[PDB]
Amino acid sequence: AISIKTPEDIEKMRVAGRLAAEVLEMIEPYVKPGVSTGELDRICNDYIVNEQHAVSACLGYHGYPKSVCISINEVVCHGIPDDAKLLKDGDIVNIDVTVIKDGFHGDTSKMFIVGKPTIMGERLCRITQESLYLALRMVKPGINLREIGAAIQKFVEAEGFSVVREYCGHGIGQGFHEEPQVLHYDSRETNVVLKPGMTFTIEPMVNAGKKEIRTMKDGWTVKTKDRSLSAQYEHTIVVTDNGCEILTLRKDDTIPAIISHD
Numbered sequence: 179a180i181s182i183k184t185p186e187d188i189e190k191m192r193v194a195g196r197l198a199a200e201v202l203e204m205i206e207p208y209v210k211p212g213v214s215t216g217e218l219d220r221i222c223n224d225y226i227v228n229e230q231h232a233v234s235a236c237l238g239y240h241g242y243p244k245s246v247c248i249s250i251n252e253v254v255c256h257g258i259p260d261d262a263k264l265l266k267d268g269d270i271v272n273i274d275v276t277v278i279k280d281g282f283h284g285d286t287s288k289m290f291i292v293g294k295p296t297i298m299g300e301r302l303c304r305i306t307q308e309s310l311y312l313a314l315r316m317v318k319p320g321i322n323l324r325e326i327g328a329a330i331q332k333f334v335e336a337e338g339f340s341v342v343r344e345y346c347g348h349g350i351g352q353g354f355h356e357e358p359q360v361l362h363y364d365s366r367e368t369n370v371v372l373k374p375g376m377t378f379t380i381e382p383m384v385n386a387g388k389k390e391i392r393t394m395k396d397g398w399t400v401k402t403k404d405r406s407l408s409a410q411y412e413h414t415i416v417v418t419d420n421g422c423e424i425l426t427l428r429k430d431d432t433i434p435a436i437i438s439h440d
């Protein structure tokens with residue numbers, strides 16, 4: 179049930195991927211102390227709809243009431259935007275976007291540091307991105323996804339942090355969440371060999387503290403059990419003949435779009 183994309187399919191994901199990356203690049207100037215998450219959400223939505231002529235995949239998904247996910251500090255993921263939640267100096271915030279264009283999905287997220295960063299915040303964001311980059315560098319045909327989850331874990335743990343088990347990367351295409359489940363840790367349950375034409379996301383969530391998490395009464399919001407800060411980055415990629423191509427690459431990414439093995 180793992181869908182293999184045709185080249186035409188891939189051309190469309192490249193567009194959707196770029197659109198999604200673009201929302202992230204666009205929003206940056208608005209991320210400042212005093213802005214509410216509800217306003218960031220509206221700016222995004224407007225852009226998506228009125229400028230891009232695309233659609234947010236989040237709006238209505240299983241009942242999701244907003245256009246993007248905004249997770250502050252200890253919120254792990256799926257934080258709900260709100261007019262009352264204002265950003266302060268030193269906050270670390272994840273903005274997660276998923277756009278639909280020509281029926282294809284593009285899913286990506288990045289951390290933003292509000293005003294003057296904290297040492298921990300900065301550190302955690304860095305290590306989290308590096309862990310995603312590490313995984314990307316390993317992607318190529320013939321390798322088992324298991325090896326990827328394991329390298330991520332090993333890296334993160336050596337850096338004194340913890341990896342969230344409960345949520346993971348996923349296949350993506352015409353469908354928002356397709357097979358397979360991309361675990362960010364070492365698990366004997368994982369046994370998936372990569373092949374060209376496969377499209378999925380890698381989106382490790384790392385905790386400054388302990389790995390444990392808790393779901394809010396809102397049924398969306400996830401927070402760390404120990405209230406420590408949590409960070410995440412996400413990219414959508416396609417497995418190529420000799421490596422991978424990052425479909426959601428941004429101007430600020432410091433990794434090449436095409437990774438080649440030889």
Ligand SMILES: CCCC[C@H](N)P(=O)(O)O
Pocket residue numbers: 236239242247255256274275276285355381412
């Ligand atoms: C409404 C659920 C939002 C899904 C997230 N973009 P992900 O698939 O990265 O967890």
Ligand SMILES: [Co+2]
Pocket residue numbers: 285347348379381412
């Ligand atoms: Co995703």
Ligand SMILES: [Co+2]
Pocket residue numbers: 274275276285286287412
């Ligand atoms: Co996402």
Ligand code: NA
Pocket residue numbers: 249250251252253254255270271272407408409410
């Ligand atoms: Na967070």
